[PDB]
């Protein structure tokens, strides 16, 4: 009969949250944060006037763009959580969310033994420990306390635990989907929207409105095809003294791709390096969440010995950048796409011609260097290795002893404070790229065509898009507006009454 919607903006000009106001409930969906864009202080000042109004929080992806602000919110507004706010999320979103948060807060210096420390590692753990864990289809009955509020999570297929939310009240009903993959990938099943007959899920059928976005899409090619293309780029990358560097989101593409390079290695030594502030935790967590991955993947690896999809003999090595030297020749390197790490790696291996940079997506929000590297390639005229011959400005960190006045695979004590603090002194450096660069679209997201076809399969009158209009695909909007669907292009930070 009437409810309010609001796309939160902390100053980065993008949506860092969706607020839904129903008669007696105010829910916050996906409070994101991008440290490289908004500072810790600006982040706080933004949410300060928002938190006291929030009742329920829900997370739909383990990515910082969906849950990046949670630990900072929990730490800075603890009283509001201990008193009423309840955070709900899928198990994997909780667990990988704690790895994406660590890497992100670490890179930006929010946590760690630095003069800029704002909170501690144990603070991130405590924040996620307090999230109410869910399984897909597990009903969150809040009908008595919040006038018929029911929240249901379904498989969205982007990250393990990724989800699509079915929000309801005795009258209104919203289908939320920030990110979803219509097709399957190496480790996840397709989104639970449509089944093995293309018939839309029972519930979710007649939504008072669909809340989503249309600014990012996967390739129009089937997964199996994209998989082969990725596998080829690896063979050529490892060719000769071939060395490969793959920037990755530890809660996103990493687990997918790891599984794929594993399906190439143990099907024919070249080590697999993992540089992440969370170190080995992403692999551990993954090993304990098998019931969330597709059965196909699991059986594919069962047929072998008691081999997990996340283990490769004595291959895997968990190391830091100042240890890249130890591995001379061929080597596949997964680097957490966080600026503090990415930048140190490009500086150490970008000058070599025996290096092949594999970029899996259109842009990188936490690493300005990869975006700069994207422009150079796109500035020059399927899987071709563009050879670099260009200089680029890159910021580098040198940890200096804190004199400016102080007054095993999962172990992260190095991020805790003991007695050795230091300041991160930044300096801009120049690097001449001679490495090779490959650009693919391996994003486990729904392609443009499918989106315009599936979304209407729900007898929904409205589809609401977030963030600013400028990123919302004008193209697909037409098709939808054509198919008698009202499309509301949301503004930033402005409540909007719907019916």
Swiss-Prot record:
Chief location category: nucleus
A GO CC annotation given for this chain: nucleus
BP term (GO), one: mRNA processing
Superkingdom field: Eukaryota
Recorded GO MF terms: RNA binding
Location within or outside the cell: Nucleus
Keywords: mRNA processing, Nucleus
Oligomer and partners: Component of the cleavage and polyadenylation factor (CPF) complex, which is composed of at least PTI1, SYC1, SSU72, GLC7, MPE1, REF2, PFS2, PTA1, YSH1/BRR5, SWD2, CFT2/YDH1, YTH1, CFT1/YHH1, FIP1 and PAP1. Interacts with the CTD domain of RPB1/RNA polymerase II; the interaction is enhanced upon phosphorylation of the RPB1 CTD domain. Interacts with PCF11.
Note: Present with 3060 molecules/cell in log phase SD medium.
Known role: RNA-binding component of the cleavage and polyadenylation factor (CPF) complex, which plays a key role in polyadenylation-dependent pre-mRNA 3'-end formation and cooperates with cleavage factors including the CFIA complex and NAB4/CFIB. May be involved in poly(A)-site recognition. May be involved in the association of the CPF, CPFIA and RNA polymerase II complexes.
Protein name (Swiss-Prot/TrEMBL): Cleavage factor two protein 2
Provenance organism: Saccharomyces cerevisiae (strain ATCC 204508 / S288c) (Baker's yeast)
Primary gene name: CFT2
Part of the intact protein present: 1 to 717 of 859
């Amino acid at each position: 009969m009437t409810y309010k919607y609001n796309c939160c903006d902390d100053g980065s000009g993008t949506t860092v949250g969706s607020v839904v106001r129903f008669d007696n409930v105010t829910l916050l969906i996906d409070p994101g944060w991008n440290p490289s864009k908004v500072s810790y202080e600006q982040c706080i000042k933004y949410w300060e006037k928002v938190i006291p109004e929030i009742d329920v929080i829900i997370l739909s992806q383990p990515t910082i763009e969906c849950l990046g602000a949670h630990s900072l919110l929990y730490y800075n507004f603890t009283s509001h959580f201990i008193s009423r706010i309840q955070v709900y999320a899928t198990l994997p979103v909780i667990n990988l969310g704690r790895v994406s948060t660590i890497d992100s807060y670490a890179s930006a210096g929010v946590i760690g033994p630095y003069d800029t420390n704002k909170l501690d590692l144990e603070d991130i753990e405590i924040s996620f420990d307090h999230i109410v864990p869910l399984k897909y289809s597990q009903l969150v009955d809040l009908r008595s306390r919040y006038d018929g509020l029911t929240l249901l999570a379904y498989n969205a297929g982007v990250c393990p635990g990724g989800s699509i939310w079915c929000i309801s009240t005795y009258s209104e009903k919203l289908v939320y989907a920030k990110r979803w993959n219509h097709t399957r990938d190496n480790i996840l099943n397709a989104a639970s929207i449509l089944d093995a007959t293309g018939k839309p899920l029972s519930t979710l059928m007649r939504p008072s409105a669909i809340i989503t976005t249309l600014d990012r899409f996967g390739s129009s090619q089937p997964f199996k095809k994209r998989s082969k293309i990725f596998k080829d780029t690896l063979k050529k990358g490892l060719s000769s003294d071939g060395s490969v560097i793959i920037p990755v989101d530890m809660s996103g593409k990493f687990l997918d791709l790891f599984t794929q390079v594993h399906e190439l290695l143990f099907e024919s030594q070249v080590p697999v390096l993992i540089l992440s502030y969370a170190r080995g935790r992403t692999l551990t967590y993954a090993k304990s969440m098998l019931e969330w991955l597709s059965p196909s993947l699991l059986k594919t690896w069962e047929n072998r010995n008691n081999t997990s999809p996340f283990e490769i003999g004595s291959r895997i090595k968990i190391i830091a950048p100042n240890e890249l030297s130890k591995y001379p020749g061929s080597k596949i390197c997964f680097v957490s796409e966080v600026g503090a790490l990415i930048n140190e790696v490009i500086i150490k291996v970008g000058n070599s011609e025996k290096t092949t940079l594999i970029l899996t997506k259109p842009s990188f929000e936490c690493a300005s260097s990869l975006d700069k590297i994207l422009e150079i390639v796109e500035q020059d005229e399927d899987g071709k290795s563009f050879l670099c011959d260009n200089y680029i400005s890159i910021d580098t960190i040198k940890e200096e002893p804190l004199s400016k006045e102080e007054t095993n695979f999962d172990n992260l004590d190095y991020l805790k404070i003991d007695k050795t603090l230091s300041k991160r002194t930044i300096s801009t450096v120049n690097v001449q790229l001679k490495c090779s660069v490959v650009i693919l679209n391996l994003q486990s997201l729904v392609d443009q065509r499918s989106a315009s076809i599936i979304w209407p399969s729900l007898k929904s009158r409205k589809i609401v898009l977030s963030a600013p209009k400028q990123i919302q695909n004008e193209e697909i909007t037409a098709k939808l507006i054509k198919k008698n669907i009202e499309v509301v292009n949301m503004p930033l930070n402005k409540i909007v009454e719907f019916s």
